[PDB]
Design a protein around this ligand. Structure first.
Ligand SMILES: Nc1ncnc2c1ncn2[C@@H]1O[C@H](COP(=O)(O)OP(=O)(O)O)[C@@H](O)[C@H]1O
Ligand SMILES: CC1=NC(=O)N[C@H](c2ccc(F)cc2F)C1C(=O)N(C)C
Ligand SMILES: [Cl-]
Ligand SMILES: [Cl-]
Ligand SMILES: [Cl-]
Ligand SMILES: [Cl-]
Ligand SMILES: [Mg+2]
Ligand SMILES: [Mg+2]
Length: 265
């Protein structure tokens, strides 16, 4: 069906470990979209063919306004191409570099949109496992959209693949290589809420070794400007024991969230 000739390619949107992502327009329809390009040699050398498969399968079936659509794929001799919904306002990562910190209302709105999307996912027992700002995209009305389902799986779960870069968003049970489930995404939600308000993630350090220590011991502290209600929500999400972390419903109904978010459930 689809081939490279069906598209005109435009500017680079971003770079991943494997993904090189371009703006593109389909010739017959003039449909604007994003084209995620992957090198077959790189995928093979790293041995992550199963991740790509899961990304396509999971993200093509999901339908939710806060989850990025995947329309299709094709491949030639050297490359694989994923056909994605184009997110015109870019990444949450970028927006954070621009503004340094988000205010409480921006933060709570983003957390609600996140919790809504994750609730939809967990209902099918899909866990994302790689929730972080570079993988959170923004729509034309500024609405948050979860993307990059490469690490996602069905629960319960062990980990078969080597951890790549930053440990910053991962809970103790996943970095210690133990078994894990849905609550991993709840931990990550707490890490994000903190980073949104403060400008950096709670377990950030100079070395991999030190970050691992701070995560496994849950060693974090708050700046003075973080309010009582945000402290309450964040402290509930970052529990060492996954079973003590709240349900997503409790997050969406948390007093600080409801007082400050500009969107519903
Ligand atoms: N649909 C999209 N619209 C706009 N930018 C995107 C889109 N998809 C990815 N990007 C940009 O490209 C980067 C890499 O994409 P991603 O799919 O996360 O690759 P990887 O799987 O290698 O992490 C993202 O961090 C983002 O900056
Ligand atoms: C149906 C397919 N048949 C193929 O022969 N190769 C593809 C392939 C699959 C895993 C992979 F890591 C790399 C690949 F090129 C393929 C596929 O499902 N894609 C998602 C591109
Ligand atoms: Cl179409
Ligand atoms: Cl497993
Ligand atoms: Cl795995
Ligand atoms: Cl729930
Ligand atoms: Mg990514
Ligand atoms: Mg990926």
């Amino acid at each position: 069906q689809w081939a490279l000739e069906d598209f005109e390619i435009g500017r680079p949107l971003g770079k991943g470990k494997f993904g090189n992502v371009y703006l593109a327009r389909e010739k017959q329809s003039k449909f604007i979209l994003a084209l995620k390009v992957l090198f077959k040699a790189q995928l093979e050398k790293a041995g992550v063919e199963h991740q790509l498969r899961r990304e396509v399968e999971i993200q093509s079936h999901l339908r939710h306004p806060n989850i990025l659509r995947l329309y299709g794929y094709f491949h030639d001799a050297t490359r694989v191409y994923l056909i994605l919904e184009y997110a015109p306002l870019g990444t949450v990562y970028r927006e954070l570099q621009k503004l340094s910190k988000f205010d409480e209302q921006r933060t709570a709105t983003y957390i609600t949109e996140l919790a809504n999307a994750l609730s939809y996912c967990h209902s099918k027992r899909v866990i994302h496992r790689d929730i972080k700002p570079e993988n959170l995209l923004l729509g034309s009305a500024g609405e948050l959209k979860i993307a990059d389902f490469g690490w996602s799986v069905h629960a319960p779960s062990s980990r078969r693949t080597t951890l790549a870069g930053t440990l910053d968003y991962l809970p103790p049970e996943m970095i210690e290589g133990r078994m894990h489930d849905e609550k991993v995404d709840l931990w990550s939600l707490g890490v994000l809420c903190y980073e949104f308000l403060v400008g950096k993630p709670p377990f950030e350090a100079n070395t991999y070794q030190e970050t691992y220590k701070r995560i496994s011991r849950v060693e974090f502290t708050f700046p003075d400007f973080v309010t009582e209600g945000a402290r309450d929500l964040i402290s509930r999400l970052l529990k060492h024991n996954p079973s003590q972390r709240p349900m997503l419903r409790e997050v969406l109904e948390h007093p600080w969230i409801t007082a400050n978010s500009s969107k519903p459930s």
